[PDB]
Design a protein around this ligand. Structure first.
Ligand SMILES: NC(=O)c1cccc([C@@H]2O[C@H](COP(=O)(O)OP(=O)(O)OC[C@H]3O[C@@H](n4cnc5c(N)ncnc54)[C@H](O)[C@@H]3O)[C@@H](O)[C@H]2O)c1
Ligand SMILES: Nc1ncnc2c1ncn2[C@@H]1O[C@H](COP(=O)(O)OP(=O)(O)OC[C@H]2O[C@@H](O)[C@H](O)[C@@H]2O)[C@@H](O)[C@H]1O
Length: 238
């Protein structure tokens, strides 16, 4: 394999031939350097947004991966122009990343239960690492988890305080944002490339009348997601 050792781990991690399996992902997986601009931001994002609720463990960033799904740059071209784009977390089970890298992040299928969603069927993201990380489903005897950072064309956010069984958006709206109580400090954000990164520490949002602890982000068109990084986390339980 003409690949770094960290990558080959990632290959075996998902599946279960290496280079045959790498093509099946249809994704260019480069390892980001630990002493770089990206890494110093990405690992700071993970440090700051580790929330007070989710103290059952502390995180440790093992390997970062710059990812580039095939054809995803061209599919995202319309939404590239749209304003308000954030780099947001999306945790998932390690089993699923085979399908995700190959087919992208997709909407939950027509059959799946519609009762068990906050803001209808869409694609969920968080500005807190600890909220998304929960959906890696790492256990004591399986404490290594994969988490996505994605460029998400939010656009005009329909900012709600309480779950709503949405189908169609208001006109002009492109995303839905669930307003949470505790938020990454807005005035401590930075811009990596043409993207907002909400890497502030957790503070009160000033939003009184909402049920959500943390913010969440939903998009209903699968072309509004551009995957950027695919971290490898270590859950250090207490
Ligand atoms: N999971 C999060 O990062 C997350 C972020 C913020 C907030 C939340 C909160 O969790 C609630 C549930 O969200 P859940 O992640 O289960 O998403 P849901 O829509 O129910 O389930 C679909 C799953 O299918 C995965 N997938 C997508 N494409 C593919 C593919 N090609 N191959 C294989 N798997 C694929 C996708 O990643 C997700 O795990 C939600 O209501 C919300 O309150 C989660
Ligand atoms: N009225 C609601 N309808 C549907 N889903 C809801 C509702 N209120 C909350 N949820 C969902 O429950 C979760 C709560 O979101 P946050 O307030 O940000 O809290 P979270 O970070 O997810 O941690 C609390 C979560 O873990 C457990 O304690 C508990 O099961 C709870 O869902 C999210 O998945 C959110 O979409």
């Amino acid at each position: 394999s003409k690949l770094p050792k960290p990558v080959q781990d990632l290959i075996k991690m998902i599946f279960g031939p290496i280079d045959v399996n790498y093509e099946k992902l249809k994704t260019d997986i480069k390892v980001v350097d630990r002493d770089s601009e990206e890494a110093e931001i990405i690992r700071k994002y993970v440090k700051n947004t580790h929330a007070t609720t989710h103290n059952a463990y502390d995180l440790e960033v093992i390997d970062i991966f710059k990812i580039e799904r095939e054809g995803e740059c061209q599919r995202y071209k319309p939404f590239k122009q749209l304003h308000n784009r954030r780099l947001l977390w999306h945790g998932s089970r390690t089993t699923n990343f085979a399908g995700i890298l190959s087919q992208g992040l997709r909407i939950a299928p027509p059959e799946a239960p519609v009762t068990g969603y906050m803001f209808g069927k869409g694609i969920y993201f968080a500005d807190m690492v600890s909220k998304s990380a929960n959906y890696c489903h790492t256990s004591q005897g399986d404490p290594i988890g994969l988490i996505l950072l994605g460029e998400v064309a939010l656009g005009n956010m329909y900012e709600l305080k309480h779950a709503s069984h949405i189908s169609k958006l208001p006109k002009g709206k492109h995303s839905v944002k669930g307003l949470g109580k505790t938020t990454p400090d807005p005035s401590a954000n930075i811009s990596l490339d043409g993207v907002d990164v909400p890497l502030g520490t957790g503070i009160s949002s000033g939003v009184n009348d909402t049920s959500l602890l943390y913010n969440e982000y939903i998009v209903y068109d699968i072309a509004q997601v551009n995957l950027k990084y695919l971290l490898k986390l270590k859950f250090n339980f207490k």
